[PDB]
Design a protein around this ligand. Structure first.
Ligand SMILES: *[C@@H]1O[C@H](CO)[C@@H](O[C@@H]2O[C@H](CO)[C@@H](O[C@@H]3O[C@H](CO)[C@@H](O)[C@H](O)[C@@H]3O)[C@H](O)[C@H]2NC(C)=O)[C@H](O)[C@H]1NC(C)=O
Ligand SMILES: *[C@@H]1O[C@H](CO)[C@@H](O[C@@H]2O[C@H](CO)[C@@H](O[C@@H]3O[C@H](CO)[C@@H](O)[C@H](O)[C@@H]3O)[C@H](O)[C@H]2NC(C)=O)[C@H](O)[C@H]1NC(C)=O
Ligand SMILES: *[C@@H]1O[C@H](CO)[C@@H](O[C@@H]2O[C@H](CO)[C@@H](O)[C@H](O)[C@H]2NC(C)=O)[C@H](O)[C@H]1NC(C)=O
Ligand SMILES: *[C@@H]1O[C@H](CO)[C@@H](O[C@@H]2O[C@H](CO)[C@@H](O)[C@H](O)[C@H]2NC(C)=O)[C@H](O)[C@H]1NC(C)=O
Ligand SMILES: *[C@@H]1O[C@H](CO)[C@@H](O[C@@H]2O[C@H](CO)[C@@H](O)[C@H](O)[C@H]2NC(C)=O)[C@H](O)[C@H]1NC(C)=O
Ligand SMILES: *[C@@H]1O[C@H](CO)[C@@H](O[C@@H]2O[C@H](CO)[C@@H](O)[C@H](O)[C@H]2NC(C)=O)[C@H](O)[C@H]1NC(C)=O
Ligand SMILES: *[C@@H]1O[C@H](CO)[C@@H](O)[C@H](O)[C@H]1NC(C)=O
Lengths: 558, 66, 65
């Protein structure tokens, strides 16, 4: 395609600007087609829109690698010397080919291996010994069984079966993938793939800062772990749980023990008073299935935020799929781009969790809205955790009981210390128990990439990290035959996982900064940012720059 | 020596025949290099704390039997 | 068997001491980190069950002195 073929640019500064403008003029259309075909994949509505996504992804890949090859062969000293941030960002973004530096056979093998890993993770099943006609899958059978069944034998059987089935056939593929990725990103210029992943955060002392940050957060997790271990010892007895050692990594919450929400059933501080988990008040008030998005929009408008374009209410579906085999349920908000519009694509229910998710995705749309004036490459918001942090600080401000009472969902505020402790512990079983995770997973992956973890030390290092940071022992004796890191979704599907840790750390910092700015110097639970135009202005000012300046400068600003 | 930093090449060249013999013996015996099953721990001896002063030497056993 | 058998221990002891000094090993992962290094480099497993009350690094002469 002539549009996909780069033109001519000089080594002059005007030449670099011409390159940036041409990249805008081409990548805008390219990303339009890519994201349109991306929307087309609603769980195979027509079963052909999926292959349209595949072809458009190839279409985008070829254009990206062509532009990057041009930039590499023409713009080395400009990358080396020029100093203003926007052009350095553009040139660095275009310079990284990623997997486009390998030969044709090696690149084809790399893509085949990636698809292999994703598929073998997706269609991994657990079958009972009798070999019944049905076999459990991760969703929605295994997760529900592990989050509901309080039987040690059943929990252990599900955990071990899933881990074996999804990890054992995933080892050689991951070894070969690590080799290929290391070769590609060493040709790119970084010492390793892990160095490339850390380079998104723009910090020479990223690992040291992360270690110090986790050392600061240690006592909270220690107390929470001791409390939950005492509760589990009371429940499951003494033979299976040690009151000093770790707790087995199947007896709490999810399959990977990242979130402990499902433990809250047996670990409630004060069960005498009912918790604030109400849905009947929403239906009594006669809310729509879509008016939740509208009240989120008016909440944004209150503090002069999110001038939502009307195209959302005509081209964005905010509901469950009435017709067609569309998406079942996910947590994404795909943007129409166009340089014009975006879209929300989610599920609608009556619970408060759905409302909080709605507010989170509306915050993500708000993030999309503010940086439109920036070039194409300056679309990601500074630190890759900024998106989640900004979309979650608003949800933190929203889920407070005071917010609901002041917005009509609740008759009156429940000002009780017992209720505050109950809600704080409920929210601390997913926003604290996950903190050792993420850090753990990405430390293991950095070690695997860098060569400190050869293919003969995968499970050893994985479980050393699990017992060290998270502190959960394997109920069944594992060894190097197993690959327990491949059971996690983000290990086969190559995706960094420290972004969630950084965002969990950052959202509370943003919340505290906004609360201090909002002029309410009290407890941080009931600190909704409603009806505070100065806080909205400050949040808009911070949200304006997406990757235009290093994230440290924006953080210092906020 | 003629080289700036340390090197394992002289050591490897030093132990070449013993390394070759060890490799061939390990291949013959059908062993696995390294230690899978890393979380393996030997059991305590039966009646450990007060059963230490018991002779378990093969040569002593043969001499006593004879 | 005199020298090759020793090399991992020389690589191991000062690595543990560096970890302890650098702060990566607080005074609650002394034995844990020590035995992780012992199993990782030397292929040696503790005969009896060792836990955090023990300090199986002061047994070596060069750690206390
Ligand atoms: C990144 O690339 C995009 C696409 O090429 C650029 O967006 C386009 O920018 C031009 C101005 O450079 C816009 O035209 C202006 O629009 C309004 C119309 O009311 C008005 O300000 C002017 O009269 C002018 O016509 C244009 O609408 C806009 N979009 C498209 C689809 O062409 C963008 O400027 C590039 N960014 C940078 C930093 O170069
Ligand atoms: C990982 O991806 C590779 C491709 O790089 C997959 O290799 C696949 O291997 C199977 C056989 O193991 C091939 O099936 C073919 O079927 C017919 C039988 O008459 C014949 O064309 C060949 O003799 C061969 O057996 C298959 O074509 C080949 N490629 C693909 C894309 O599937 C491999 O299966 C993947 N790994 C896993 C665990 O599935
Ligand atoms: C969202 O809510 C409005 C009302 O606030 C919906 O208007 C419908 O019209 C009747 C007229 O009597 C209202 O009383 C009902 O509450 C509404 N019917 C519903 C929600 O089923 C409006 O259609 C809704 N917007 C949508 C569904 O996009
Ligand atoms: C919920 O209760 C807490 C006390 O547990 C309230 O704390 C208030 O604190 C301020 C100073 O920060 C005092 O001036 C108030 O008298 C306290 N109120 C009390 C004791 O009722 C907290 O403000 C309450 N939340 C809301 C939204 O009213
Ligand atoms: C790692 O441990 C697993 C689990 O015990 C071992 O897998 C078993 O191996 C035995 C002996 O070969 C087989 O009879 C079983 O069928 C295997 N079970 C499963 C569930 O795979 C494995 O052999 C051990 N690996 C090493 C290298 O010691
Ligand atoms: C272990 O038992 C083996 C037989 O399984 C012994 O081999 C023979 O033992 C007899 C005495 O029982 C000796 O007279 C023979 O000379 C042995 N045969 C050979 C080929 O040496 C063996 O001596 C026993 N070893 C120990 C250490 O107890
Ligand atoms: C500019 O580069 C393009 C690359 O497509 C090439 O076709 C063209 O001849 C070049 N022009 C000059 C003047 O160097």
């Amino acid at each position: 395609d002539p549009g996909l073929q780069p033109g001519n640019f000089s080594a002059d500064e005007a030449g670099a600007q011409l390159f940036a403008q041409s990249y805008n003029s081409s990548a805008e259309q390219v990303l339009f087609q890519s994201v349109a075909a991306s929307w087309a994949h609603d769980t195979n509505i027509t079963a052909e829109n999926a292959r349209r996504q595949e072809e458009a992804a190839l279409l985008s890949q070829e254009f990206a690698e062509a532009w990057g090859q041009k930039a590499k062969e023409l713009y080395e000293p400009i990358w080396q010397n020029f100093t203003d941030p926007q052009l350095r960002r553009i040139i660095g973004a275009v310079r990284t080919l990623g997997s486009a530096n390998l030969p044709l056979a090696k690149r084809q093998q790399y893509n085949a291996l990636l698809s292999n890993m994703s598929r073998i993770y997706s269609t991994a099943k657990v079958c009972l010994p009798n070999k019944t006609a049905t076999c459990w899958s991760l969703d929605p059978d295994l997760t529900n069984i592990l989050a509901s069944s309080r039987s040690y034998a059943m929990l252990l059987f599900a955990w071990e079966g899933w881990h074996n089935a999804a990890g054992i056939p995933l080892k050689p593929l991951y070894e070969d993938f690590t080799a290929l990725s290391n070769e590609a990103y060493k040709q790119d210029g970084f010492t390793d793939t892990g160095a490339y992943w850390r380079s998104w955060y723009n910090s020479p002392t990223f690992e040291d800062d992360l270690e110090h940050l986790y050392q600061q957060l240690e006592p909270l997790y220690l107390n929470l772990h001791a409390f939950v271990r005492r509760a589990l010892h009371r429940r499951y007895g003494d033979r299976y749980i040690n009151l000093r050692g770790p707790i087995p990594a199947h007896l709490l919450g999810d399959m990977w023990a990242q979130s402990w929400e499902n433990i809250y059933d047996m670990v409630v501080p004060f069960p005498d008073k009912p918790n604030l988990d109400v849905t009947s008040t929403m239906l009594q008030q006669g809310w729509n299935a879509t008016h939740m998005f509208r009240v989120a929009e008016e909440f944004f408008t209150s503090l002069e935020l999110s001038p939502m374009p009307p195209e959302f209410w005509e081209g964005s579906m905010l509901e469950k799929p009435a017709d067609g085999r569309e998406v079942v349920c996910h947590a994404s908000a795909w943007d129409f781009y166009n340089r014009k519009d975006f879209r929300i694509k989610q599920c609608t229910r009556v619970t408060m969790d759905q409302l909080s998710t709605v507010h989170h995705e509306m915050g993500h749309i708000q993030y999309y809205l503010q940086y439109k004036d920036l070039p194409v490459s300056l679309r990601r918001g500074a630190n890759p955790g900024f998106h989640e942090a900004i979309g979650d600080v608003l949800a933190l401000s929203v889920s407070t009981p005071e917010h609901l009472h002041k917005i009509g969902l609740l008759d009156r505020v429940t000002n009780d210390t017992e209720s505050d402790i109950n809600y704080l512990l409920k929210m601390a079983l997913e926003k604290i128990a996950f903190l050792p995770f993420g850090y753990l997973v990405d430390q293991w992956r950095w070690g695997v990439f860098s060569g400190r973890t050869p293919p003969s030390r995968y499970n050893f290092d994985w479980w050393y990290l699990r017992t060290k940071y998270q502190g959960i022992c394997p109920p069944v004796t594992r060894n190097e035959t197993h690959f327990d890191a491949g059971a996690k979704f983000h290990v086969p599907n190559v995706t960094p996982y420290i972004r969630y840790f950084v965002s969990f750390v950052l959202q509370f910092q943003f919340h505290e900064a906004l609360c201090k700015e909002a002029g309410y110097e009290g407890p941080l639970h009931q600190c909704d940012i409603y009806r505070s135009t100065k806080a909205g202005a400050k949040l808009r000012k911070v949200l304006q720059a997406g990757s235009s300046r290093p994230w440290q400068e924006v953080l210092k600003d906020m | 020596v003629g080289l700036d930093a340390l090197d394992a090449q002289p050591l490897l060249k030093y132990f070449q025949p013993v390394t070759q013999w060890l490799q061939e013996q390990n291949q013959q015996n059908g062993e696995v290099l390294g230690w899978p099953e890393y979380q393996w721990h030997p059991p305590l001896p039966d009646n450990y704390p007060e059963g230490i002063d018991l002779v378990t030497d093969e040569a002593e056993a043969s001499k006593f039997v004879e």
